[PDB]
């Protein structure tokens, strides 16, 4: 029992500070106020090494564990501004580059695993359709096996990076009698004959995050563009929203950091009735709960990103950090705002912003009530 | 005791509701993209009987109470999606022309009421300073008395309708030395020589309903523009506050019933796993949550309400009904858009532009923590 | 819509009122610390209109509405700190009399209702079962028809004033292939063969309450014991569970009331770091918070009240109110506690076993979670 | 940064809770019902090692750290029902053994400290009085200087032990003047003349765990008897208070830990409506709420004692533990009494008896909203 970084691990954690915030949020908010996701600085981003993650050194990776992976993410999220590219690099590593390197085959990871780690190309995950969001095994579409590959027709909405993915990594049922083993997962290019990528649809949560619904019209899946074997999708992605729920949700833990420590300044400065505001205690309590769900949150994050690289059974922990931390990002951001004031209502201070970038952080990588389920499943609950 | 409305109090709540989804719902979608504040429906809505709440006959009201004021406002929430262009309108009713009505002389209502009454002027409230916010009778804006009036000078903040005003009901001391007792009213014209207006402010809460700083330089005030009595201004400022604590108020209530109605209507209509999303209990628990908290809040309101209209002190019951308005506004508009998951992001369904137009409820006519210093004196704990 | 008692309603809250002080309130200290349950004082509250209700004066009662009845039992709870007795004659009061009024033939409100109206009989009410509790209806003691009557068989549990009970109201399925419309209701008298009460089971909520489990080994009732039509007892215990609810509820509300007021008292007088401990916000915060619970669940009592008194559906308002007032109860009973400190540790204080008697409010008459079922049924959301 | 104990560690653990398993709890429920605190059990919790602690072998102890001393600790709160009993040696661990090791002189602890690490002799500490509860530095006490040593006078309340004790650690005024400098500490032995020791006050509370008042009149005190230098009490009062909140918490931790176990087994063997009740999310959210808190404050607890052992500044992070488990058992006391239904109101079931003796967790060693001003203080909010 130890709660000391390593050296090797603090300088993973300062070398991402240093980039997000002399890189990254230099100019965000331009970006942020023009809704612009920039390529160019996503790609750095990228080759710096956010969409590296436990990659081999042979595709370009630092074979970085779980817990290193979440330093440099909450290093991102505390660093920058704009969560927003964050959260498509994130997504982008979490639900793409690591299911290609973790099940893809060696021909398919020569041909595309390090273009993605590098960033040279951007990828997006497209599971969820209309009638499949938390029940995501009853989607619907169909890669139906034939000569050659599989014929793919479907639709799928709420996809990150689709309006600027240069390949798709698709889930499709190849036997669409099954739920959970009836999913095959595949890789696709943008420009496939058949498939129709939608325009970005607007959103004010992450709003410089582009996303958009694709469809899939008698696509043609070469054999060789399946990831992993037949059936085997829905354990793909299970095993990415681990990396994703684990991860990912790192960027919101860095983020709280960086909200408490405003809100700390605001409330040693700002003087009403001849004090500090921070002297009252209904205002001193608010930031008291924010410090104890900052700590608490990381803690639970760090052993669960721990005990994954132990080789544990690490799925309800990481389902237990994925709710605390969305949950608690969620009532801090209304806290900061409760002890600016009317102050709070200013888009420069970027307060308001905040909390509706922490708003998704409960939903996307599967619900807070589904994290709730697979608790209640490893508990015994659900037998 | 008795908890039906008269036939009287439902015809009054039934026509606005009318007018709010005929009238001024119609292409609210449009303005809303385009963070427009339509003075022409603006004027309309204060005609039909929006800004005219207690105030008489003779100057062109219907000398409603206070509970019938706070169901026309509550239909006006309920009926309307802009609730910038309602909140507006609430404010120049309870802060601008409920105290020229309460507490101007003859001649400064012959000149100005009817006119505010109708909507042909527009008017806002400026109290609040850079360093009197919470602590509001620390304003130092000071009204310098001199042979024929007052000379002015000093800052005003987060002014409701400023960019927008013919008028301006200002708040400023008289007796630097006091507090409470040293402030005094006045109503000044847009225009008059040494007011500067600033340009709208813009805010992503409430984001088409204006709002600006203005700086006095030197304004003289004439004799005949004082409200009320010299060092009055305190009682003033704490009498419009109740009126707008208390109905309008009303306006989030209203947006809570309309917003349960379409959480609702979702939970039955959504499936996943098989069945509509309301039948787990995890979502049926939050809704019921906000409709707990609409049936008690609106118990709340109406009471406060009732006793102001029979003479009672109702201080304590308008700050509670405040408090707890506001934060079930807020915390509702989290559940809503937990209930409908990814499909909350659309700008169309208007959900997360429901909560951050309720963010501000918190903060403004005195913070909540504010209502509770308040109600905690009015229980004998500050003395 | 008015908020004020008639002064017919305002004499009948102050009339029990002054009984619960001077009557029962006096010696309860050691009535409680020696768990006794006084019948001779249980007898003399229920003569004295307690065990009322709406009974008719053709039984001995004053024919009150729901409304006027909770305002009699929050008195009640106001008055005595001698909650277990107040408990154990509201359960007599609905479970008991009130369906054996609504429901009995003519022959047995003759023989049995004047005599549990005045006390001169207790009742209980035997409808739990080991093996149905929430789910009720799913009650396995049988009551098989035979000539003359039935052969009643089975086991009940948790059984409050079966240790002191004269006469027992038993549910038990006369259709045992049916649910709900299977069971019958009966009346059965303390002796008859082949009935076996269990001595008091010893609890420490409510701890003066007598409560225990029954035995049925073949016993006859005969046909004239049946309450109301055969397979009615599910809507028989249905309707109980109302009044149980509505009104027995109250009695939590003005034990609140009682609450409030001593820790209004004590945060007034205690002083610390040179002041009364009502000073500090987070003391006078949680005391608000009290203040705010007590305010919303009184209205909503009212209200579902007032509303069968009207007629209305007023199941939905009763669940609602049912479920505030017992989460409010307890958790009032937690900040009461926090306020006094130490000196909370006290058994002349009461505010330990206040806290105790509370715990099972959300637990009778169906829990807490039953509650927003039967909320969830009347939304829509169990379709 | 790791998360698994070392060998060591978990032979510490283990050996504990067998002991409290197989020695302490034998027999649990006659003593706690008869409320019997036995003192030759307690000699042989306190032999074994459980008065131990940081004491160093020449005194008869095992120099263990705070993190070992808290998992000790979390062992005999889960394997050992008597509270109360474990509750009385911790305190006599942490703020009278402690105490005497850190800052007693070589004379001092020849004479007493072996005895109060084998139990041989029980201490209690007396601090605490009338008016000087959260605010105890401004204790009223008067241990006025004279030759050979010091008068003293005063009345202590709320002493845990004192009762049984044979040895008594004062904290009162060698200087009047001041508030935290002015206070010594000091050993008296249970009969010196002038010391009068109150009879037990019951509690239903810890109701096992006698307290009482103690009352000195012009007790001499000699020299060699202060604990620590003169004006260092507040000083060692202070670290006192830090062993009692950072590692006698741990055995709210360890009881929590108990309690979530009872609670997942009933809700999976109790069925209802054809189902175990944990099927219900209603149920399975709240044990997921118990399990997410002893997850998080049990990480909490272990980093802030780790922190302690590794010579860092750990007072925030143990009053952040103490704030979190004492506000976490209580509501996880009140959720598993909710799981069980009727069934808890049960004394042989212990579930009711938990929540009483949580309840005051949140008050001794300093109250939670005292734990949120020293939060406070740390973070900059009280400069
Ligand atoms: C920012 C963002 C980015 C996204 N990116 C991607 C992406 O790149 N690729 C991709 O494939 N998807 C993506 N998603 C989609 C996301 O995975 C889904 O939104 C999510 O799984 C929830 O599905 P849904 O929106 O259909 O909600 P629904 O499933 O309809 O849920 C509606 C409500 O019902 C509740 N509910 C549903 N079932 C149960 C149950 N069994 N028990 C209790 N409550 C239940 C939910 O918790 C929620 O409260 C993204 C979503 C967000 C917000
Ligand atoms: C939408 C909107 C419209 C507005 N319209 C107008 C308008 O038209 N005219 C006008 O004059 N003003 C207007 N206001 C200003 C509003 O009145 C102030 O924002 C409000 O009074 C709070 O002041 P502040 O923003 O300076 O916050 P501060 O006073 O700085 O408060 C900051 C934080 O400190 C807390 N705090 C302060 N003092 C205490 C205390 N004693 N005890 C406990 N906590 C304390 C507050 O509760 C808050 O959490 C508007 C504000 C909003 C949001
Ligand atoms: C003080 C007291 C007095 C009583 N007096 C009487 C009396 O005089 N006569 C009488 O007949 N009974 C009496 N009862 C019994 C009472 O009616 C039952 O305790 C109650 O209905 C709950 O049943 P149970 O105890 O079997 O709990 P269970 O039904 O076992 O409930 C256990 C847990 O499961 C939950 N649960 C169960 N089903 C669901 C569901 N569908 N959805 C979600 N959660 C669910 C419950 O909410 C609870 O959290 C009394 C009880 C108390 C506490
Ligand atoms: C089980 C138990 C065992 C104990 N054992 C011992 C023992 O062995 N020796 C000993 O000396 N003492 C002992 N104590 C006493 C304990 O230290 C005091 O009870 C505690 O410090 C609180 O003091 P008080 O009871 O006077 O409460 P008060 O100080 O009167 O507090 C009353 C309320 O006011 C609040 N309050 C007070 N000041 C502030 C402030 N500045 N800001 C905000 N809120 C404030 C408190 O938080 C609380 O809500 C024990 C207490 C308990 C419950
Ligand atoms: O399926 C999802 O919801 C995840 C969220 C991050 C990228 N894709
Ligand atoms: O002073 C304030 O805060 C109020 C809010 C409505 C208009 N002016
Ligand atoms: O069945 C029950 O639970 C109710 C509680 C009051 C009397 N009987
Ligand atoms: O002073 C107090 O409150 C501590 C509690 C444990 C023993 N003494
Ligand atoms: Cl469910
Ligand atoms: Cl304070």
Same mark, same amino acid.
């Given at each position: 029992?130890?709660?000391?970084?390593?050296?090797?691990?603090?300088?993973?954690?300062?070398?991402?500070?240093? $980039?997000?915030?002399?890189?990254?949020?230099?100019?965000?908010?331009?970006?942020?106020?023009?809704?612009?996701?920039?390529?160019?600085?996503?790609?750095?981003?990228?080759?710096?090494?956010?969409?590296?993650?436990?990659?081999? *050194?042979?595709? @370009?990776?630092?074979? /970085? @564990?779980?817990?290193?992976?979440?330093?440099?993410?909450?290093?991102?999220?505390?660093?920058?501004?704009?969560?927003?590219?964050?959260?498509?690099?994130?997504? *982008?590593?979490?639900?793409?580059?690591?299911?290609?390197?973790?099940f893809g085959s060696?021909? /398919?990871?020569? %041909?595309?695993?390090?273009?993605?780690?590098?960033?040279?190309?951007?990828?997006?995950?497209?599971?969820?359709?209309?009638?499949?969001?938390?029940?995501?095994?009853?989607?619907?579409?169909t890669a139906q096996p034939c !000569?050659?590959g599989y014929?793919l027709?479907?639709? %799928? +909405?709420?996809?990150?990076?689709?309006?600027?993915?240069?390949?798709?990594?698709?889930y499709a049922k190849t036997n669409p009698d099954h739920?959970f083993l009836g999913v095959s997962a595949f890789?696709?290019?943008? @420009?496939?004959?058949?498939?129709?990528?939608?325009?970005?649809?607007? %959103?004010?949560? /992450?709003?410089?995050?582009?996303?958009?619904?694709?469809? $899939?019209?008698?696509?043609?899946i070469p054999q060789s563009q399946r990831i992993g074997m037949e059936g085997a999708g829905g354990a793909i992605? *299970?095993?990415?929203?681990?990396?994703?729920?684990?991860?990912?949700?790192?960027? $919101?833990?860095?983020? /709280?950091?960086?909200?408490?420590?405003?809100?700390?300044?605001?409330?040693?400065?700002?003087?009403?009735?001849?004090?500090? +505001?921070?002297?009252?205690?209904?205002?001193?309590?608010?930031? &008291?709960?924010? %410090?104890?769900?900052?700590?608490?949150?990381?803690?639970?994050?760090?052993?669960?990103?721990?005990?994954?690289?132990?080789?544990?059974?690490? !799925?309800?922990?990481?389902?237990?950090?994925?709710?605390?931390?969305?949950?608690?990002?969620?009532?801090?951001?209304?806290?900061?705002?409760?002890?600016?004031?009317?102050?709070?209502?200013?888009?420069?201070? @970027?307060?308001?912003? *905040?909390?509706?970038?922490?708003?998704?952080?409960?939903?996307?990588?599967?619900?807070?009530? &589904?994290?709730?389920?697979?608790?209640?499943?490893?508990?015994?609950?659900?037998?």
């Amino acid at each position: 029992m130890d709660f000391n970084l390593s050296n090797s691990q603090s300088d993973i954690y300062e070398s991402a500070y240093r $980039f997000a915030c002399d890189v990254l949020d230099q100019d965000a908010q331009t970006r942020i106020s023009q809704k612009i996701l920039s390529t160019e600085l996503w790609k750095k981003a990228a080759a710096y090494g956010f969409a590296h993650g436990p990659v081999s *050194h042979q595709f @370009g990776g630092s074979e /970085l @564990g779980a817990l290193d992976t979440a330093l440099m993410i909450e290093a991102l999220g505390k660093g920058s501004r704009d969560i927003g590219l964050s959260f498509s690099l994130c997504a *982008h590593l979490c639900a793409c580059v690591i299911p290609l390197y973790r099940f893809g085959s060696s021909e /398919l990871k020569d %041909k595309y695993l390090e273009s993605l780690v590098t960033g040279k190309l951007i990828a997006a995950n497209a599971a969820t359709e209309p009638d499949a969001g938390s029940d995501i095994y009853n989607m619907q579409a169909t890669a139906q096996p034939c !000569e050659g590959g599989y014929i793919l027709n479907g639709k %799928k +909405i709420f996809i990150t990076n689709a309006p600027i993915a240069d390949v798709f990594i698709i889930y499709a049922k190849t036997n669409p009698d099954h739920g959970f083993l009836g999913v095959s997962a595949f890789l696709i290019e943008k @420009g496939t004959p058949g498939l129709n990528v939608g325009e970005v649809i607007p %959103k004010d949560c /992450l709003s410089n995050c582009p996303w958009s619904e694709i469809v $899939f019209n008698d696509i043609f899946i070469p054999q060789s563009q399946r990831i992993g074997m037949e059936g085997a999708g829905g354990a793909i992605f *299970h095993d990415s929203m681990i990396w994703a729920k684990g991860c990912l949700s790192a960027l $919101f833990v860095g983020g /709280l950091a960086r909200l408490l420590e405003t809100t700390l300044e605001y409330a040693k400065a700002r003087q009403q009735f001849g004090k500090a +505001i921070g002297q009252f205690q209904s205002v001193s309590n608010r930031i &008291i709960d924010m %410090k104890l769900r900052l700590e608490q949150c990381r803690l639970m994050l760090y052993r669960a990103c721990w005990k994954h690289d132990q080789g544990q059974d690490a !799925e309800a922990d990481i389902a237990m950090s994925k709710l605390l931390i969305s949950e608690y990002a969620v009532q801090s951001g209304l806290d900061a705002i409760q002890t600016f004031g009317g102050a709070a209502m200013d888009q420069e201070l @970027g307060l308001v912003r *905040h909390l509706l970038n922490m708003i998704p952080s409960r939903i996307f990588s599967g619900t807070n009530d &589904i994290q709730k389920e697979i608790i209640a499943r490893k508990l015994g609950l659900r037998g």
